[PDB]
Symmetry: D3
Subunit: 140 residues, 6 copies
């Protein structure tokens, strides 16, 4: 056995979605106060940038940390759940957990981990809600 | 009189909004066929980039095509109508004109022209629905 | 009849390709002198950004200058010819016209025009050879 | 004779400079009112993005609108005048014309035109004072 | 008690400032040699990008690592000290510590920490002096 | 002695290169299957973004983690080996190690470390093969 160099591989994609920040554990007034304009009753939306970062040994034969073709398919499966959708209304997960970008990052990390051929190399998910507001999550 | 150099001045801002592409002049099936995933019943959303381009003589005293402080205020007035809103439900204009980015560009151009201290220098509006889909409008 | 507002619609994609700048109408020395490091005998490469800009009346029913789904398919047909290829060796056109980005812009414009469902709205092609070197072409 | 396709070629570079917006034709109070925080007595600064756009026939032999190596040298000559400098204090031109980005665009266009091997193809200069504030100039 | 997922939240803003790199502990010649063109006597300037990264448990009710509205106000307080200013002349801190971007990152981190409602979640500051030169600091 | 604040300094540059992903330890069919379109026999290419990140104590006199002028020269030496070249054919290293971006990141890290005046501060190399595919390496 010979341990190979450890490298990271990150793949960037995006999805467009609507949402409204509204907690079922808060009153109407509290939701307005906590979430401000993000609580607009008819919602608003974002192009979310999703970056998926893997870390692992370089394979000596393929030269890859992970098969990009395989990652593309797995990421597509996750993106299908959220792209051109309303997070709070169309995605079961967000019925019971507020759709802040913190919680979106967690959702995407966990859903991806659930579909991956080799989930052990999943290292970090990034969600950019806008170019100015960036969230990351590395799991438990 | 002495005509001064003609220069353009462009200012970039953004707004987050939800929408759904659905024409009242189309059947449900036709809307699905025309608009595809963009017709998702609960909508989706974008961070829209708005660029406002002015063209005019440079003022010999101030060195400006237009007062940026004034433009910022006028652009804010327009952005207030759409930011963190649902275009089709919250903005009267989109009740009767489909919220394609073509029509958003027209809306923003016309609304801005309506609030400007000097609307004669308004030259072009750009809307980037995503980084990959860009629309421009120069008026009548 | 009622002429509708004229708007532009631009769609951005990319392709990765190898090339070498070498004219069959120049000597070896002249090619080295004209093209410098771009004449490296084993070639070099770029991620080329391709932007396709259309201009036309907004449709009153669909709200679109052109059907994006249709454009995506037509652009794919063109991109298939160049993506992950060697321009000078794999693309017949470049056997007899030097693969400068000027000539790539012309190639992509003409090939796209050749496959378009409605080529009359094609307005401009942009090729970014790198983020710093940008070329555009509007046809004859 | 055979007229060749007309293509544009644009090259992007940058320079870092300090400035203060202050007109000798305005009083202290007027300068404060016209220029606001831009009139800060000790100045402020920008990374200015400079884009130089040329337009002309493609050469049948070289495939180029202009020799990029030559443009790089000519642009360097202009950039030497402004990079890591204070516009108002170090550049003679700005002693008598206010250093607004409108006037910077004009300055760079004219200075470049003055050093170019083939100035007839110079088509447009862009200055981005910040990513949000963009100016262009096409000459007389 | 139940420990919640740990997520990062990063907010990006910018400021324009002039500076000159000049150490009071170096001779004129040494300053020229150490700092080169950055020692230009009348200074130069940058649009500095500032990114503020927080790390902490997601709140189960609000879904947030930190209140963005609160962060915006706190970051504004820091930005007021440097925006449209000359670092070395207008900001007391830089009279006695050289205004390299390393030291700017430290300054902004410490000043922000000093005004924060909950400074325990401050994790990292980034300063981009230009798009090509990036500095980060995580405190003591 | 007094330990100074630890800060990172990162410098971004780029190079254009051709390559083909093909392992000498795989059959023709296996190479096609492993590498797909990346195995195109005449190759393809990328503008690779290279970021070089250093980490170390801030110098109390210069205010720098490292001399940028020195880093620029050292990075140039590495870039000379790959810019406007074919990785697999022109660079000895890639004759025996597949030119995946994982292995490019390792190559650039090790080659830079080999030429650095102070290699102890080298912390991380990033290679962006395209804007969507990003690799990093921190050494052994
Ligand atoms: Na909302
Ligand atoms: Na975003
Ligand atoms: Na929809
Ligand atoms: Na956008
Ligand atoms: Na070559
Ligand atoms: Na490019
Ligand atoms: Na000032
Ligand atoms: Na800028
Ligand atoms: Na200076
Ligand atoms: Na910057
Ligand atoms: Na290949
Ligand atoms: Na890249
Ligand atoms: Zn939101
Ligand atoms: Zn949409
Ligand atoms: Zn090339
Ligand atoms: Zn300024
Ligand atoms: Zn500086
Ligand atoms: Zn490749």
């Amino acid at each position: 056995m010979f341990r190979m160099p450890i490298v990271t591989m990150e793949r960037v994609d995006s999805f467009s979605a609507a949402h409204r920040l509204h907690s079922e554990k808060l009153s109407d007034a509290e939701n307005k106060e906590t979430f401000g304009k993000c609580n607009n009753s008819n919602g608003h939306g974002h192009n979310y940038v999703w970056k998926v970062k893997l870390r692992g040994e370089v394979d000596p034969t393929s030269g890859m940390v992970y098969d990009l073709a395989k990652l593309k398919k797995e990421m597509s499966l996750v993106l299908d759940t959220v792209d051109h959708r309303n997070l709070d209304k169309d995605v079961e997960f967000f019925k019971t957990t507020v759709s802040t970008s913190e919680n979106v990052a967690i959702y995407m990390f966990e859903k991806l981990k659930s579909v991956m051929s080799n989930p052990s190399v999943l290292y970090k998910v990034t969600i950019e809600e806008t170019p100015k507001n960036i969230f990351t999550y590395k799991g438990s």
